[PDB]
């Protein structure tokens, strides 16, 4: 095969992208290559053997909060793949974790496989489709070298967790809970692009703090840990082919 | 210079829901992959009188062949169709559950006034309203006057069933209709500034006495014919009119 030459990061919140942007000296795109009048942000750069791009769903028109959730993440994954034809996608972001599954605040996890906990369609065939079980691209050398934790990720468009959500998340044996991962994998699967995840724990879903409060409290520090890992991930990938990880 | 509507996109989640409409207007399946290669998405195009008509579906899933329902695939095809096909107006036609307390009956084909999500709960200020994603459908007063369709709020979520948490939000948002793509089509259409209108045909009563999946499957064929019937009259009404006339 050929060495990986192009990597796209899909990152939901702009402050989580920014340190990575600055670290690799990436520039904000000016020519709206993913479509006109869109709030989306793309940062581009060439670093050693890798073209590097980072896409975010951008600041919402009303208030400028990050356009989080499965739909915007799915849109930018699709558009950036079609526009750039990367070798690999990395969906980097924050997530909730389970203490009983070994998750701690500030851990940056790799993901083995990914599901939805909030697409409940109680009809055969549709049920499995809804769950949308998908495997992350195998990166055994990356995991070993960086000494990263790993677990199943469960995706849904809510930050909190209803009773029904929790039953499905426990049943699927997830270590991690986010708001976009499985939608990224659906699009990547559709377009035959390998996908890796980097999910950084801001809050303990089985813990003694409310989710929204804990997430907001740890966001700044955990973002920094996520940048430290994503940086190492980029350097590791440089000059390797997909077989090497 | 402004002009009468020349191009319409239909976004339809299930192929069987799209076919009656395809047959009615003699549309043919595109072979040129206008939205991108290697995808399961299906596009039908044709010309009826003064209007070019595109019907797009998220396609049958690779595993078992079932319709790729839900907000993500709908929002992708909306996005790709807008960019490639450059429509004047989008119509999101599909089936939905209805609340009989809100005046909905099985076989009713509604015109949506506005749209929300009931399954994006982000209990943080600013994020909360964003998650709900309240959006107004394009104003079509004359169409409503002509066609006499019931109207009401649509509430969107990626589940066919309704958890207790979903219900609380659906009740408080005073929706008449419940579906699986609507608010996401609206989101995408807003982003790209395309007028969107919704035709939602009631297959099951969320506050009735029949299990949802069961009632939906039972009524799907007859309600799909009803939906074709309304969409046909919508297409014929739009013909020759500008946006501001509906
Ligand atoms: N408990 C939790 N559930 C879902 N997403 C979470 C989370 N904690 C952090 N996040 C992530 O950070 C923010 C969202 O984009 C989401 O993906
Ligand atoms: N009770 C219900 N809840 C949600 N969606 C429904 C529904 N009944 C029919 N539908 C729609 O029909 C099909 C799904 O894609 C969904 O959009």
Curated annotation (Swiss-Prot), chain B:
One matching Pfam family, short form?
Answer: PNP_UDP_1
Q: Which residues act catalytically here?
A: 17, 204
pH effects: Optimum pH is 8.0.
A GO CC term?
plasma membrane
- Residues reported to bind S-methyl-5'-thioadenosine: 95, 178-181, 204
Enzyme kind, highest EC tier:
hydrolase
The annotated phenotype of a deletion mutant is:
No visible phenotype under normal growth condition. Not able to grow with methylthioadenosine (MTA) as unique source of sulfur.
Q: In which tissues is it expressed?
A: Expressed in roots, leaves, stems, cauline leaves and flowers.
Q: Where does adenine bind?
A: 178, 204
Please report any disulfide bonds recorded for this protein chain, giving both cysteine positions. none
Q: Tell me the pathway.
A: Amino-acid biosynthesis; L-methionine biosynthesis via salvage pathway; S-methyl-5-thio-alpha-D-ribose 1-phosphate from S-methyl-5'-thioadenosine (hydrolase route): step 1/2
Q: Name one GO biological process term.
A: L-methionine salvage from methylthioadenosine
Which InterPro entries does the UniProt entry name for this protein? Answer: MTAN (IPR044580), Nucleoside_phosphorylase_d (IPR000845), Nucleoside_phosphorylase_sf (IPR035994)
Regarding activators and inhibitors, the annotation says: Inhibited by CBL3 in a calcium-dependent manner. Inhibited by 5'-methylthiotubercidin (MTT) and by formycin A (FMA).
UniProt record similarity statement: Belongs to the PNP/UDP phosphorylase family. MtnN subfamily.
Entry function: Enzyme of the methionine cycle that catalyzes the irreversible cleavage of the glycosidic bond in 5'-methylthioadenosine (MTA) to adenine and 5'-methylthioribose. Contributes to the maintenance of AdoMet homeostasis and is required to sustain high rates of ethylene synthesis. Inactive towards S-adenosylhomocysteine (SAH/AdoHcy).
**What is the name listed in the Swiss-Prot or TrEMBL entry for this protein?**
5'-methylthioadenosine nucleosidase
> Which species is the source of this protein?
Arabidopsis thaliana
Could you tell me the gene encoding this protein? Answer: MTN1
